[PDB]
Amino acid sequence: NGMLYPQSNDSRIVFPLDGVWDFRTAGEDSYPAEWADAPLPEPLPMAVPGSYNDQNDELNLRAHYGWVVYQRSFAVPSRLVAGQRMILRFDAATHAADVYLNGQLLGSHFGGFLPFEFDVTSALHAGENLLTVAVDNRIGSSTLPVGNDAGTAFMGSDNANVPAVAEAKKHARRQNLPNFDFFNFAGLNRHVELYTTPADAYIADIAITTERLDHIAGDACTAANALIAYDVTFGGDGRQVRISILDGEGTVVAGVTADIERTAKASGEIAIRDAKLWNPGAAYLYTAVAELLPSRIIDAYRQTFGIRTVEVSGTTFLINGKPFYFKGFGKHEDSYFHGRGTDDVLNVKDVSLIHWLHANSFRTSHYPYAESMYDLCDREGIVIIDEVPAVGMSWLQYANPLVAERHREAIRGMIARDKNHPCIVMWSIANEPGLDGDGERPRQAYDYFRPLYELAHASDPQNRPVTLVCCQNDYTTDITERTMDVVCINRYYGWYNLSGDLDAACHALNIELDFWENIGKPVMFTEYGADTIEGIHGTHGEMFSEEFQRDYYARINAEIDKRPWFIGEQLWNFADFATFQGIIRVEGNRKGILTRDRQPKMAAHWLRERWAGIPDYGYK
Amino acid sequence: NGMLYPQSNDSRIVFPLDGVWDFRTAGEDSYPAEWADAPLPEPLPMAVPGSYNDQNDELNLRAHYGWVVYQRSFAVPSRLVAGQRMILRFDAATHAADVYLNGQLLGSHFGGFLPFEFDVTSALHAGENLLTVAVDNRIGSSTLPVGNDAGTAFMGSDNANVPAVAEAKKHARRQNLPNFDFFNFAGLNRHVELYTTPADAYIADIAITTERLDHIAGDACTAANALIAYDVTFGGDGRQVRISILDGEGTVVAGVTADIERTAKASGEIAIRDAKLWNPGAAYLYTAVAELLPSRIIDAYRQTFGIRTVEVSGTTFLINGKPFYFKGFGKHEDSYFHGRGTDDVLNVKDVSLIHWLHANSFRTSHYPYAESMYDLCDREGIVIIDEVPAVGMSWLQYANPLVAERHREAIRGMIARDKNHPCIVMWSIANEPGLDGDGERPRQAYDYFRPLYELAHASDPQNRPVTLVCCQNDYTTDITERTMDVVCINRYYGWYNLSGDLDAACHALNIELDFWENIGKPVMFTEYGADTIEGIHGTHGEMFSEEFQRDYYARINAEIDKRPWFIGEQLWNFADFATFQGIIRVEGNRKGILTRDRQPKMAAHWLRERWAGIPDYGYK
Ligand SMILES: CCCCCC[C@@H]1NC[C@@H](O)[C@H](O)[C@H]1C(=O)O
Ligand SMILES: CCCCCC[C@@H]1NC[C@@H](O)[C@H](O)[C@H]1C(=O)O
């Protein structure tokens, strides 16, 4: 179950496999398996990690459909592999992969945004090892994210009534047809590494939870006592594990020795006096150090955590008992050359921009992000809504068992990976699925999502609130969204409807707000905005102008400020990002308050000024 | 019936009333009648000729709905008006106008793009006269151009299924809802002037036609003989008119004296030996001087004309018996400050750009242009397709008698105004009306348009071909377009459908071309293109990039080059232009091969190179 990030210490070593690999395109539905047996013929270079799509301008890899094959060689000293458990880890391969080592099929994985690993202890040998990775970019009615099996792309234009169009369509080059509004970047998007653990016995998983806070200070910087719980899982094979809690200075402030009982597990509680709490804009991190005992140490893992509680109470969202207000945006892992490839420089910069903006949060739209970003937000005090790639879903998917299982895999996987991060305060199990309509459609959606809501709660030891991000729909026939712990709505009044009429947009908004006022749940924006080309200006700003984007947030935010039960504003988007091409996408999605190069539009400055005056706690 | 452009000579004088007028906005469906009786209170300045919408950044006049009121004073010497017929002419008031002089109602008008005039001989007085003009910008289901009585604008975004949206819309500020893709610029868009004629008898109209050419030279520069016909109409009351034909140097090369017969009218024929012909890229103009005889002259008018024939023969378009090929675009009267206001500096520049591009033609999409532009094209050898404002029409309009009458008014008005221009070779009676579908819809469309086709032929003494510009539709059920003299098609394969896939776009195009091949009419493009933001670049050009626009024309034009019956390529558009705001309009319509400031995008350079190698005559 556990997927702890690979760590180097006195018992463990990590060997990164990132760099410039060999690369070939393959077929729409196959690749030569014999490529795993020998070096790739006439290979291209391809940097790892990164999307492959924008790394070769001679080819049109954005138009590629089907398989590609990665390959490299590597060698490690025999004395290091000696007697160790050897694990090959892929942080992410988008969307599906077959992995070979020295011609042996290790196995396969579906899911483009979560890590997977293989025990390669027996497949390794001395000298050069040959690592071959086939990657499948194809999406469809059974994938998450959801693709279309025929027709158009998300908001795609057609003149189906023309006989000539209908015929040409049947003979067109086959392409991925996304039911989502972000480009299908594929490949080894995140790191690849080989790591070691002890073989006889090793720590397989660690879970830390904040169970109770006693007598929280007025400023919530401290609690008189904090009761935390640990749960350690072991693999391999009156054994014991030592748990030391390190404060921010490395001083051991608490420690217990727990017995391991066999599913080898050790669990218990630890009381910490005058515990320092983790808050938005004021992070504090402890380290839980677990050491497997035989004075010698068998195995060890250092797990960062933060002490904080999260509770939905009525129409309030309480972090350490204080009413929190979300200030932020949905993001994307998107940048010019890397595509969906992880880039720690960009992550560090983006975190600084969030502070510059005086935002305090974002959502991982529309997939779990690279693990390093959460670590970064843990230490920088930025709150996260963590979301699985369940985007583009409709009734066709709810009836599909493969989809249901892939959806369960993602929810359990995301939470298994991310459970220990204090910055994560809420889980999102889908973005804009079909939930409304007539007949049995609302009930069908509910019956699909309710067990996923329950699963997210069951999987998370911290028991954080669970939500589903709702598209702009008929909210009166939608019966699912209102049952979530927090109502998260995507609304584009004045952009996709009532276009350009801000008086009418605000009037319509207030009408839907009157509806939600009665539901009595806490409600927040997870999307709202307007496409905006930097440099377009007007004295009376029209759609696509910098001025209109500014006016838009000013008019909308003035309305939600009148609602005490309205607990957050996360806009769309942090920055312009790449999409499938189309008549409404001007070099991608331009709803960023920043450009793709992270430069601030007029609206960013206005938002920065507004957010500077809004406190993390007690705004409402 | 005649609306000769006002002329100054020894019998006639023109007094221009252009300049900076007084101006007030008024109500959605009324204005204060006393504003005609006295100076406007607290007036704004408003230059005229010009649209009013972009002349005041303190107001949002683009959002204005209903009436505005113009006013100025003027005074002329009594000795000039004495014994003269006094006429006040409005070259254009968009869309409807009520005109007052000195508190007296002169009358009203509805056509927004054609001239109208009043006899003010008796309403004028000595000293300052007060001229008040109320202008109505409203469009709807009975106007040409066509507006929507409710709902949305063109290619407009909606979420009607949301209850909040439905309610807000019913309370929204009233706005014009166009069924066309160009902004509803309104006001005194063209010149205003007072002119004089003799009172007792005067020249009211002149029509010149090329009846026959005998033995045209091999280079079509001359004909051994040209038979031209004249028709002069008189107003007022053995009278005679002298008709002198002047060549380009002012030399009298022919002269006849004709008897006036009573609708007092004189008509006859004149033979011109070794006549110099008017051709695209090689214009030649004569002047017909008509002089009403009492050695004294009663009245006189100089009418410019050019000697050329136009004939559709099979799948060829013959000018002076030679097979012509259209190279060009649809235009707009559109510019940054003037709006739809006429600007002869811009007209002169645009004409030089047409030469720069090596284009030879354009269409007056989607309304008759200012008269000065046709004079310009007469002397510069650019061919024109002249079009009435019948845009946005569908079955709702075909059943409305008021629309039918306004449509007949526009066709007769356009042809009465423009009949003498040699540069005009074809008439267009609509742009993209609804023609297709099932049941009686194709037949209903046919029955509406056939008598308008016949009317256009009956109204034009030169009997030029008549067309109707057809939208991208179901060409198999459309029964109207294939009966026009030239088939003019607007096609957006690869933009609005098969988006971004030029292979599939060309495949679909060729399928429709296979259809038109058998119809046996000459066929041309009147629209095709792709929105393009200057400065957006890619190695593999996607939609909105300069490269994609270039690739688009390159792939499409290669296909039509294979069809001998395809006699012209007029793209969309000459230059970026203003539209109603919406999610597919990035600061207006960006399908220009030039920017709104008339700067060339990449495609313009490519098109210039292609057109440089295509001759006006004999390409096919
Ligand atoms: C109003 C109904 C349509 C709203 C759709 C808004 C879309 N939501 C999900 C995001 O991934 C898209 O980028 C966003 C958009 O298109 O910018
Ligand atoms: C593909 C079927 C619809 C095509 C419509 C294309 C439109 N025709 C008339 C022009 O006035 C518009 O500007 C043009 C467009 O939108 O650029």
Residue numbers in the entry:
A (entry chain D), B (entry chain A): -1 to 235, 274 to 298, 303 to 334, 342 to 667
Quoted passage from the original study:
However, intestinal bacterial GUSs cleave the attached glucuronic acid for use as a carbon source, allowing potentially toxic compounds to re-enter the enterohepatic circulation. However, microflora-encoding β-glucuronidases (GUSs) are notorious for reversing the glucuronidation to release SN-38 in the intestinal lumen and thus represent the major cause of undesirable effects. GUS contains a deep enzyme active site (the two catalytic glutamates lie ~12 Å below the protein surface). To understand the underlying structural basis, we prepared C6-propyl, -hexyl, and -nonyl UIFGs (2–4, respectively) and resolved the eight X-ray crystal structures of 1–4 bound to EcGUS or Bifidobacterium dentium GUS (BdGUS).
Water molecules I–III were conserved in all of the BdGUS structures and located near the UIFG-binding moiety to mediate interactions between the inhibitor and certain residues. However, LgGUS and BdGUS have more spacious aglycone-binding sites than EcGUS and CpGUS, explaining why 2–4 did not have high affinity for LgGUS and BdGUS. To develop inhibitors with higher affinity for LgGUS and BdGUS, a bulkier group should be considered, e.g., phenyl group.
